Amino acid sequence: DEIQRRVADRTCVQEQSTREVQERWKRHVVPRMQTDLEFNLSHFKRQHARGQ
Amino acid sequence: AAAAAAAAAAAAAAAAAAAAAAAAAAAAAAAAAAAAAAAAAAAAAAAAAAAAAAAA
Amino acid sequence: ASPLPVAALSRLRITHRSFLTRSRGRHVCRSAVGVEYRPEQQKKVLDHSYARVINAEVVHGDEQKFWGERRTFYTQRNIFFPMWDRCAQALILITREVPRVPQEMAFRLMAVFLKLMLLPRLMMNT
Amino acid sequence: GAKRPLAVVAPRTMHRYLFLMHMEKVTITVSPLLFGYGHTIQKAVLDFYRRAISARSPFPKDKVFLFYAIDHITPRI
Amino acid sequence: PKEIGFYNAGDNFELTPQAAYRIYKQNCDETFWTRLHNEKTIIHLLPLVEQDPGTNMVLVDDIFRHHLKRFGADHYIYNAVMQAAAFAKDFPRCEQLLAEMRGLGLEPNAQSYVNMMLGARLTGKPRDQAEAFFREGIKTGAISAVMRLDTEFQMWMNQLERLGSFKAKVGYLSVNEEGASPMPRDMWALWGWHRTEAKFISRKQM
Amino acid sequence: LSPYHRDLRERELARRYLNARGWVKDMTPEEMRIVFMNYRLPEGEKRKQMDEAAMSGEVYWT
Amino acid sequence: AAAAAAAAAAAAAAAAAAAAAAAAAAAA
Amino acid sequence: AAAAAAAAAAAAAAAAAAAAAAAAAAA
Amino acid sequence: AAAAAAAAAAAAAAAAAAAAAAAAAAAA
């Protein structure tokens, strides 16, 4: 517990934030987000390919 | 059990996998709701989705 | 009980490779654990022939300026932009709204009429 | 394919820069969907990239390819 | 007390099996208990496993199932139990395990192939079942061999037969004598060159 | 006060966690949004940020 | 049914093919 | 004729499809 | 579901054609 507490006190204050950002993402984004990302990436690929 | 070397997980340390909505879990559940609900609500939803198709 | 989702099993993989490494004369056991594309889809990544993985420079032109960007705004500290914001901008841009075509909305408007016109066609088929 | 056996001893130095040696390509794959704050392996790999494409890098800047992946890839070089 | 553990002939503190299993049984759900601690325990159980495979395997499966419900599935645990089965001389259990690895999406590690060569060997099965494991493992890109395959494989086999198991007539594991001491008979012993590098250090430094 | 960072639940107990160790205790939250703000940030965007309405408009759409 | 129709309108051609094939395979 | 349509608009997918299999089996 | 099918099975061909004409005129 000393080891992991000292390691945590080193690098762990961040995942506090990472959590609430993550759940902000799942609340305000994921519902209205697109279902298919592959067609999106295809779209981007042909769009960039067309010079547009 | 007195000496462990360095722990390593499936995801990264201190990095969370951010959610994304996939294919089946959305499509098939929408088809399931449309199924078991009614063809009246599916008709009105066909009218709102054709509203979004004409708007598009 | 799978660590990966059922869908990704045909694509992804979970690799664990453990190494003995030297630290100040001592030897520690550190492993690299990672989720990775399978060898076939990997060789398709290196070829740039793979969907589901997009080249970065089409997302925002010229990474070199994008990642190599250093803040010029009222500061002589030429420090690079933070990591979190570059990642955030990236995964914002990846996830943006593609303008879904009304023609697919027409194939789906035809797909909405499936049940009604199939029961109406099955009633008049006798 | 080896006509003659391998070597037994390797030289040891500190490599400050990535320089194109016998490599013809270097691919860096990151899913931006994997995300976090602070120092993480994500940050380390992307920093690898930042270093390779930087002004002082002897590496030719045309051969380094960054790839955003959709599903949850532990960043790999 | 000598039941719990002791400093063995090389002045090394080793835990006892049945001491280890109890420590496990108490600390399983503890927050500090990591997935490596499990496999460390499983390792500590191997001699028991081999000397009596019937009643000491059940413990291995307690650790197995428990680990599985605290951390869903891992390489650590599968490697470990499959090695346990390798000493317990159940081959079908090993192949079954490996299949379960691949089916779970776990990409079998270089140690999984060494576990398979070990099981293959000490279960008294012909060569070329182990050779196929080594070669398949080298195609996979887990094992990387520098020499031609035959001689490399000979090296692995010779390295296993030196190491032959706990019940055997010859091997490293076949030597049961342990200079048993409550305390290391020299406290300033070196792992290094200097007195700086000394083997025994404070617990707050360690 | 902004769509995401505006929550009364986690904000109040933050203020009281600060009041615990005796950080600024005389503050009405609305003057806390005043005394602490980017000082080298110009005027208009600062009164824009101090206001609920002009800051209510910016939200991640989809 | 509002968000179901919002999500229905966004489906791609391969996705609409998947949903029609799955709704036709599930029922009749 | 109106009651059958207003009953059909209350029907599910399993309902109109099992009525499809029943109308195909009967007639 | 069973009552609608039992009521539709007792109808004639002209009543089923009139119910199909009413289902084409109403629901369409």
H, E, C per residue of G1-28: CHHHHHHHCCCCHHHHHHHHHHHHHHCC
Which residues are within 8 A (CB) of C44 and not within 5 positions of it... i.e. 6 or more apart?
Answer: C50
Q: Is the dihedral of CA F26, F32, F34, F38 positive or negative?
A: positive
- Contact list in B for residue E24 (CB cut-off 8 A) is 1
Euclidean distance between CA atoms C84 and C100, whole angstroms: 30
Residue of H nearest to I24 (CA): H5
Out of B13, B21, B23, closest to residue A33 by CB:
B21
Closest CA to C116 of E100, I23, A16: I23
- The answer for G 1-28 residues in CB contact with C (under 8 A) is 8-13, 16, 19-20, 23-24, 28
Contact call for B and D: 3+ CB–CB distances under 8 Å: yes
Q: How was this structure determined?
A: cryo-EM
Q: How many helices (H) and strands (E) does chain E have?
A: 8, 3
Residue of B nearest to C34 (CA): B10
CA distances from residue C26 to C29, E15, E57 in whole angstroms, order as listed: 10, 22, 34
Q: Assign C54 to helix, strand or coil.
A: strand
- Contact list in F for residue A29 (CB cut-off 8 A) is 60, 62
Which H helix or E strand runs over C15?
strand C12-23
Any alpha helices (H) in A1-52, and if so which ranges? 2-11, 13-28, 37-49
Q: Which residues pair with C17 in a beta bridge?
A: C32
Nearest-neighbour CA in chain A from F54: distance (Å):
20
The B-side interface with E (CB below 8 A) comprises: 1-5, 7, 10
Residue of G nearest to B32 (CA): G23
Euclidean distance between CA atoms E137 and E109, whole angstroms: 9
Any alpha helices (H) in C1-126, and if so which ranges? 39-46, 63-67, 83-94, 102-112, 114-123
One-letter amino acid for residue B51 of the chain:
A
Contact B30, G19 (CB under 8 A): yes
CB B25: neighbour CB atoms within 10 A? 12
Which residues are within 8 A (CB) of C64 and not within 5 positions of it... i.e. 6 or more apart?
Answer: D53, D61
Q: Is A18 an 8 Å CB contact of chain D? A: yes
Q: Assign H21 to helix, strand or coil.
A: helix
Euclidean distance between CA atoms F12 and D26, whole angstroms: 50
Q: Do D70 and A22 touch (CB under 8 A)?
A: no
Q: Is B43 an 8 Å CB contact of chain H? A: yes
Out of E13, E23, E74, closest to residue B1 by CB:
E23
Six token digits for residue A10: 């080193």
Q: Do C100 and G12 touch (CB under 8 A)?
A: yes
Euclidean distance between CA atoms B44 and B50, whole angstroms: 10
Which H helix or E strand runs over D28?
strand D26-30
